[PDB]
């Protein structure tokens, strides 16, 4: 039956749940005993095919307690009065049985949002739900879980207490998690030599444990009519000499990838970037702040508290385009191992477009379930940019959406480890009230690239590609004066372009001679091609609007040369 | 003393001019000679012409011109006091410098 | 059973509801012969879980009188007609077992509000309801008291005279109110000497009973759970001296207010300020000003009776950003033990842009609720600058959120004590209709700080923090000459980050050797340091502007 090791993916979810059921149903008189009052319902969150009910059947299976199934279509497709009575045999079924865990699989099909009902028996199979979950006075041990696919589609009644008060969300697998998926559904079958579970786990983006199994399956069933047509000899019983002779290969893998259908692509992805300071060179001083003001509030709590001095929130980034105002979020996020979520400048197009600023409030809670995490706005000045720029159509610097980012950060607690860093390459044209002291007081500005800074970069792009070893990237970087971070990548896009071209041209005309490999690296002649074609993003008469507002706000501070009398 | 861009006894080391020597400018010497630039504000109502000069190719770092204390000063000395003149300040930046961009940096122009 | 000393927070409520049920019930005979209506329905407002079947069953144990519950949900869910003979038989037996209350939990649940109800049989649940209600005129000393969330989910049918016509409102703890559910709640438990509750009370802000209840639930359960494994003592039975030799510390309670999220964080903070005038120095008349026409209406009504005077309804703040506008409010407030409301500029702005401003109304409500209350309405011309500004786009300064405030201070009465304070650091673009012999007529001048009350700032900011004798503050402000209270606040933080960083780095360096507190106080070289970062934020052009809108304030009245 099903058990832990059949599960993958999600770690700390299961976790929660174990602590939160195992120890009032493996000790039901030692509880009794005690005057706490355990839980009485558990709501799981999270897109279809993330294994729900694979995790209620086996926390039932290993803690050993009856598992009865109520299922949502199955109870509303019965006649008006035989489920209501359907409801409350289960109901009685698992009391007599106890301890016992009673899992609705589609609460929202029994119980959907109250304008979305339409209806009367509905309300009333609803009322009836609520009097049965209410009416648990202690019945021994039993524990009612339900799974839905958002928190916004359940009737509010059933989320006050008493009632599925406590949420476990269970998100999209991240790279560790798919692999471990493929481990579990491929530990039957066998793979070739060649077959690296690593590299197709971290190919797949967007992708939920379903699509992870039916992947497998494909590829199995890929090989096994890439095999089979061979003998063609469809027996009697499926004889053991052809399994075995049978292994999946990495082909069938990449074939099987190439025509998957990602379940989740849209969905907001939550995960610990795996990028790290290596990656950029320089700005020290930029990370010593991000680390002072990001790794402190979260690692030595008892020092802030003694001093009492209340953490900052937020930080904003300002400087040109392209120089690694991104990576630097994700690098920190990376440091502290906490999770990190991005939001782009088309999502908030988006929500000031459609007059949907209700979302903020989404991704606020997806944050603070998320914590410790940080929450990245890219490019907010793209409302105001979006409204005429600098010559506006009239009106003052203030929009429908950041007044709701206002409204929201205000309001959240400081206590939980919630940190915002906004990005932004026109200072000028943010509005003042984000930077008012308690939302985001600290300005910081990312200058153009340095030596050292450009020799990690092209060192981090040149990293997946073979390079020969007489390339000379110093020389390159003393070479290149007034790149930022994306001319860089290109150049070496550009040099890699070249490579192949020159090879695939090599392979055609000695396939054609060839009637009765010349190019394994990279090497100068390409790059001195690509450096050909270099063009500098940021002219010079567009970094001294930077320079000139970091000096004023720089000489603005001219009391260093106060001294106590002694 | 000096009244306005007369030559003085301090040589110039980033002589561009060629005059070899510091000009005084505003209670201060300078390298080269500014750049003149015709500038007009509407702020409540009235209308002032300005001349803006800008400094460049200054050997001394805390010489050269700042646009956002220029637009201040302007702003400040033509409509003290006046209430939301902020955005007049930023009209004047924006106006500068898209107006003292060089395409090609040997258009020295002095006044 | 339950008490009347299990209740926590809501103390003036728990007074209030005795005042109304305790002389029917005790006294049935006396109003039988006298010729006085007792009240026969109360509402019990407030957000789910703040406690109101407890109130119920409290007041139903004490007084002595038959308590009957009836649940909504429970009643909805029987079949047509049955639904009907529940709801009679249940009114039939409490008129029998007299006197008795009757307890409707899920009032918005049997009678929703009307467009929310479609089915016909819900319309004749509701009107079923509303005919039993009507029929207690009977007098068998019969009490119905119902609960909900907010007063507009409710049938207004249901708010009618002769049914439900009394109110009382629950709200969210105090601070006081959560530490004495945090003592009720852990009273059968055993905490440590480092527990103290009444921190973790002042940590805990949106959290209802029900939460905190939760919370020492979720702290006992992490304590057990540490314990358990390590004694594993996993026998047929438990033992009676394990649970006494184990108790609660301070770090079980701060991971479960770390893994604890709050149900009622969105809603109106309604409480007493605890800030008092030692926060902020000078402004002596500001202060004389303030208590003058916040504090005398609502302790001499009848000096005020006697003079003729009308009561101001309110003043409005004006003056440079971040010298303390919310302060002499939040003081004032504390010093009248009168409640605080708060409503920032981004509340407005959402008013305006989501085209919401019936909301404002609400809001009012509120405060005519809570009364005493003073009113606080901050960035009032942040509508005003948001559609344009000094020029603007298109006609006057009059808006929808400010039409909307205006219609709902005009249309109150003097007889609360409600007060409405208004800041504004760009009163150019304020609306004229607010500045009006009646609404806002009072407008008052906030400077910047002087040399004396640069003292008061810091040693109110510095209170919270370990300061080493030799720091000497007088020099500090004389320095400082021209800067507001948001520059002295970040110069006592940067001070504390620069300490804060030095202890991590030496705590850091002094586990090196270790292979093989040195800062306890705030030196005054971190001072010296922190003022290299000072910054003057209010320019001389603004002290300029604000002393030339107060000069043509002030030129006018000349004798
Ligand atoms: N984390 C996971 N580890 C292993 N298998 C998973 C995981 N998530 C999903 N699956 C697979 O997906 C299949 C369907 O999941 P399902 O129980 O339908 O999820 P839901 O009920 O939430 O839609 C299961 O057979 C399971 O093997
Ligand atoms: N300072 C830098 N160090 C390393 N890579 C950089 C840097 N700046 C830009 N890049 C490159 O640019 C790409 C992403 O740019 P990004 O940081 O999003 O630009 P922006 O800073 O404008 O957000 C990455 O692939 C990265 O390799
Ligand atoms: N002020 C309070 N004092 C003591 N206990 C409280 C208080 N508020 C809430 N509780 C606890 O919360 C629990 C649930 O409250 P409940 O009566 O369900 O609130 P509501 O009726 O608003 O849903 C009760 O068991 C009660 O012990
Ligand atoms: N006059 C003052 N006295 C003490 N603290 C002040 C003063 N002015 C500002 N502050 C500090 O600044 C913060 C917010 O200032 P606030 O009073 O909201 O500014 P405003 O007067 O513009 O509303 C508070 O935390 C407070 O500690």
Same mark, same amino acid.
């Given at each position: 039956? *099903? ?13 929660? $749940? ?91 099909? $029994? ?12 309300? +009333? ?33 059933? +989320? ?34 060649? *077959? ?41 019983? $499926? ?121 903020? !409030? ?24 979006? !409204? ?12 429908? *959406? ?23 390459? !026109? ?29 990690? $970069? ?85 970094? !001294? ?22 | ?5 007369? +030559? ?104």
């Amino acid at each position: 039956e *099903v058990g832990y090791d059949d599960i993958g993916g999600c770690r700390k979810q299961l976790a929660q $749940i174990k602590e939160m059921v195992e120890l009032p149903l493996r000790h039901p008189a030692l509880f009794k005993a005690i005057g706490v009052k355990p839980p009485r319902g558990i709501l799981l969150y999270g897109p279809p095919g993330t294994g729900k009910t694979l995790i209620a059947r086996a926390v039932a299976n290993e803690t050993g307690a009856f598992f009865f199934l109520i299922n949502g279509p199955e109870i509303m497709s019965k006649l008006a009065g035989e489920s209501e009575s359907n409801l409350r045999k289960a109901f009685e079924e698992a009391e007599k049985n106890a301890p016992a865990i009673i899992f609705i699989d589609e609460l929202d099909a $029994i119980a959907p949002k109250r304008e979305k009902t339409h209806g009367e028996v509905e309300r +009333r199979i609803v009322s009836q739900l609520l009097t049965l979950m209410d009416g648990l006075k202690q019945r021994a041990h039993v524990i009612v879980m339900a799974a839905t696919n958002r928190p916004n589609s359940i009737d509010p009644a059933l +989320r006050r207490f008493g009632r599925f008060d406590r949420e476990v969300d269970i998100g999209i697998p991240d790279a560790t998690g798919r692999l471990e998926i493929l481990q579990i559904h491929t530990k039957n079958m066998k793979l070739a030599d060649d *077959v690296d579970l690593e590299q197709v786990a971290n190919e797949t983006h967007g992708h939920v444990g379903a699509d992870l199994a039916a992947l497998c399956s494909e590829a199995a069933l890929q090989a096994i009519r890439k095999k089979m047509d061979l003998i063609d000899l469809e027996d009697e019983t $499926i004889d053991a000499e052809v399994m075995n002779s049978l292994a999946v290969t990495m082909d069938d893998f990449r074939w099987a990838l190439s025509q998957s259908n990602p379940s989740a692509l849209r969905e907001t992805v939550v995960e610990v970037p795996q990028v790290t300071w290596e990656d950029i060179g320089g700005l020290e001083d930029v990370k010593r702040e991000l680390q002072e003001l990001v790794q402190y509030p979260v690692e030595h709590p008892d020092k802030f508290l003694k001093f009492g001095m209340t953490p900052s929130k937020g930080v904003l980034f300002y400087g040109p385009p392209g120089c690694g105002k991104t990576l630097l979020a994700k690098a920190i996020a990376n440091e502290c191992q906490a999770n990190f979520i991005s939001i782009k400048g088309p999502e908030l197009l988006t929500m000031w477009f459609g007059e949907s600023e209700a979302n903020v !409030r989404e991704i606020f809670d997806k944050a603070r379930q998320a914590a410790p995490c940080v929450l990245f706005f890219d490019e907010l000045d793209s409302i105001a940019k979006a !409204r005429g720029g600098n010559i506006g159509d009239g009106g003052g610097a203030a929009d429908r *959406v950041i007044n709701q980012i206002l409204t929201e950060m205000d309001g959240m607690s400081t206590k939980k480890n919630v940190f915002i860093i906004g990005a932004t390459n !026109r200072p000028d044209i943010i509005d003042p009230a984000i930077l008012r002291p308690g939302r985001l007081d600290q300005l910081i500005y990312i200058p153009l690239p340095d030596e050292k800074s450009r020799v990690a $970069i092209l060192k981090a792009n040149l990293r997946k590609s073979p390079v020969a070893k007489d390339v000379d990237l110093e020389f390159l970087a003393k070479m290149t004066n007034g790149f930022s971070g994306a001319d860089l990548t290109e150049i070496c896009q550009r040099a890699c372009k070249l490579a192949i071209r020159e090879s695939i041209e090599s392979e055609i005309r000695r396939e054609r001679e060839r009637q009765t490999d010349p190019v394994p690296e990279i090497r100068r002649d390409h790059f001195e091609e690509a450096m050909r074609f270099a063009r500098r993003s940021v002219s010079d008469n567009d970094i !001294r609007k930077y320079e000139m507002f970091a000096q004023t706000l720089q000489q603005s501070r001219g009391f260093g040369s106060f001294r106590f009398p002694s | 003393v000096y009244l306005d861009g007369d +030559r003085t006894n301090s040589r110039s080391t980033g002589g561009k001019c060629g005059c070899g020597f510091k000009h005084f400018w505003d209670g201060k010497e300078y390298d080269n000679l500014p750049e003149a630039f015709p500038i007009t504000l509407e702020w409540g109502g009235r209308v002032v012409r300005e001349t803006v000069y800008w400094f460049q190719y200054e050997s001394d770092s805390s010489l050269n011109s700042n646009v956002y204390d220029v637009a201040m000063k302007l702003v400040t000395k033509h409509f003290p006091g006046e209430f939301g003149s902020e955005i007049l300040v930023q009209k004047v930046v924006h106006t500068i410098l898209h107006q003292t961009a060089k395409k090609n940096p040997d258009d020295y122009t002095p006044v």
